Amino acid sequence: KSLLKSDDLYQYILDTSVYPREPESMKELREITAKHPWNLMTTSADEGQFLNMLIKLIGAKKTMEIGVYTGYSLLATALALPEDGTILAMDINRENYELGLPCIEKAGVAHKIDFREGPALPVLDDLIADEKNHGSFDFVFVDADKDNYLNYHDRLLKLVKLGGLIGYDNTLWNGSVVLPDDAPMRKYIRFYRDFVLVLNKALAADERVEICQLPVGDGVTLCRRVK
Amino acid sequence: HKSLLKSDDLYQYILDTSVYPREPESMKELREITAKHPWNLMTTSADEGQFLNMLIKLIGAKKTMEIGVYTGYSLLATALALPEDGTILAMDINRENYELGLPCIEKAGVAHKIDFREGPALPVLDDLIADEKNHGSFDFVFVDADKDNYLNYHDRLLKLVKLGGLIGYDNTLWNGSVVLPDDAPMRKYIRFYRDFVLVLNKALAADERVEICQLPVGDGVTLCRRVK
Numbered sequence: 001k002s003l004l005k006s007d008d009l010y011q012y013i014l015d016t017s018v019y020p021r022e023p024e025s026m027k028e029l030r031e032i033t034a035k036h037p038w039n040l041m042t043t044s045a046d047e048g049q050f051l052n053m054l055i056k057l058i059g060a061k062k063t064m065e066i067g068v069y070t071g072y073s074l075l076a077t078a079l080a081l082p083e084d085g086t087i088l089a090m091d092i093n094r095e096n097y098e099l100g101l102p103c104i105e106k107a108g109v110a111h112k113i114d115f116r117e118g119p120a121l122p123v124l125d126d127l128i129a130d131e132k133n134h135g136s137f138d139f140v141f142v143d144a145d146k147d148n149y150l151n152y153h154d155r156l157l158k159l160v161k162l163g164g165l166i167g168y169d170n171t172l173w174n175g176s177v178v179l180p181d182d183a184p185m186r187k188y189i190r191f192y193r194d195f196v197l198v199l200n201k202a203l204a205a206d207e208r209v210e211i212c213q214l215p216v217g218d219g220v221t222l223c224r225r226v227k
Numbered sequence: 228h229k230s231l232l233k234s235d236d237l238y239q240y241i242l243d244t245s246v247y248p249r250e251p252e253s254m255k256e257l258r259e260i261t262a263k264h265p266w267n268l269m270t271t272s273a274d275e276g277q278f279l280n281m282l283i284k285l286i287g288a289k290k291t292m293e294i295g296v297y298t299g300y301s302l303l304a305t306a307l308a309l310p311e312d313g314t315i316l317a318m319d320i321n322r323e324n325y326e327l328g329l330p331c332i333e334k335a336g337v338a339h340k341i342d343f344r345e346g347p348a349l350p351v352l353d354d355l356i357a358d359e360k361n362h363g364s365f366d367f368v369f370v371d372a373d374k375d376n377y378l379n380y381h382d383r384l385l386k387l388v389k390l391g392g393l394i395g396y397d398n399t400l401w402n403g404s405v406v407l408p409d410d411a412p413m414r415k416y417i418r419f420y421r422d423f424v425l426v427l428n429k430a431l432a433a434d435e436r437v438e439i440c441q442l443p444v445g446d447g448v449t450l451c452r453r454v455k
């Protein structure tokens with residue numbers, strides 16, 4: 001299941017270092033999400049823990065999330081932000097968000113969320129149209145449609161502050177990045193594999209950011225804006 | 228075997244794609260020097276080096292500490308990331324191996340940041356703690372040394388690191404031996420420290436003075452953010 005050499009080792013991390021400290025609201029949201037047919041899309045508990053610590057470490061206040069689903073990474077983020085922190089959250093699908101929103105409200109951090117229903121790209125274009133929004137975001141978590149990540153990247157580098165951080169999710173893509181082409185793959189795995197392979201090379205060659213691709217979850221590539 | 232990941236191929240992909248094209252020349256130099264040394268397996272992997280370097284920048288650290296230096300790959304990764312006036316108090320029982328790597332660090336132009344101390348780290352920590360001026364003065368500590376002392380180091384370091392500061396304990400997944408039965412075949416040094424590591428990991432997860440995150444980078448690194 002995980003990217004690690006054994007399920008035992010992965011389960012050890014969860015049991016030893018993740019679940020004992022998982023906030024109750026996130027446990028709640030996870031268990032709700034696990035019953036939903038699209039539950040494979042949710043952010044893993046270990047990755048949620050990482051994002052939550054990352055938010056604290058970088059002192060982020062104003063963030064953005066592209067790809068919300070039922071809200072596990074969104075809640076992990078909201079809980080880590082200061083009481084007056086904000087998240088601009090985007091998903092084409094509103095109803096899955098609203099499935100998770102009750103947990104977030106109960107957690108007392110729903111006031112931080114500005115949820116927008118619809119495709120992310122036009123929202124980004126509108127933001128960029130106003131210079132006011134340039135360099136205003138501390139952090140962006142991108143966990144949506146892979147064939148648009150290069151396009152998001154172009155826009156987000158205008159919207160994120162110098163020294164700010166963008167996380168691209170699923171950049172190791174089930175480990176399919178090292179399967180031969182003729183290996184058996186699910187259709188959607190094969191389709192997006194092409195884009196992930198290009199994305200990872202484009203980020204490596206992009207001197208506007210410093211990068212770090214981590215084997216957390218399904219891979220996450222941290223991009224720190226330096227130009 | 229190369230990594231904690233499900234395949235050497237996947238691990239090699241991370242290095243080839245995302246690490247080595249970005250590795251500073253000075254670190255490549257130190258790595259190639261270190262690779263020739265008999266104890267080279269003790270060195271910090273290039274992917275972990277990259278992660279530590281980004282981490283230092285992200286948390287805005289200036290004053291740090293490293294316990295367990297060897298030839299200095301993690302030390303250099305850190306020194307490169309720190310501001311020009313940043314400092315590292317670096318400790319190792321072995322000076323000769325440090326001095327093997329010091330010329331790369333000097334050439335990289337960040338050797339002035341390093342205060343190297345030869346000897347066991349614990350009495351240095353005790354000496355620091357004896358002077359209140361040192362309390363809560365460190366931004367970051369990387370602990371990559373003797374496992375039977377990690378919990379001892381932890382209590383000392385929580386006095387020396389600022390609220391909101393960060394301690395990273397290295398090798399906390401310990402070759403994955405943490406999920407092997409006592410029965411299983413393992414190298415002697417692995418078996419020797421394995422129960423220290425199992426206890427450590429439980430103790431850190433139970434310690435409300437810190438928030439933790441145990442990452443499958445390198446041989447495992449547990450990040451501990453001081454919150455009390």
Ligand SMILES: C[S@@+](CC[C@H](N)C(=O)[O-])C[C@H]1O[C@@H](n2cnc3c(N)ncnc32)[C@H](O)[C@@H]1O
Nearest residue numbers: 042043067068069072073091092119120144145
């Ligand atoms: C992997 S899920 C997000 C997971 C989420 N971060 C979590 O923790 O549960 C991907 C999401 O991106 C959304 N999505 C796909 N294309 C999008 C687009 N162009 N704009 C906004 N959202 C999109 C999908 O509706 C889906 O909910």
Ligand SMILES: C[S@@+](CC[C@H](N)C(=O)[O-])C[C@H]1O[C@@H](n2cnc3c(N)ncnc32)[C@H](O)[C@@H]1O
Nearest residue numbers: 270271295296297300301319320347348372373
């Ligand atoms: C895994 S190596 C450190 C690797 C180093 N961070 C690097 O990137 O190459 C462990 C080091 O800890 C040192 N060491 C072991 N016990 C120590 C102690 N009690 N005090 C200080 N150093 C110690 C050893 O001499 C050895 O160099």
Ligand SMILES: [Ca+2]
Nearest residue numbers: 043143169170
């Ligand atoms: Ca994801």
Ligand SMILES: [Ca+2]
Nearest residue numbers: 271371397398
């Ligand atoms: Ca180590």
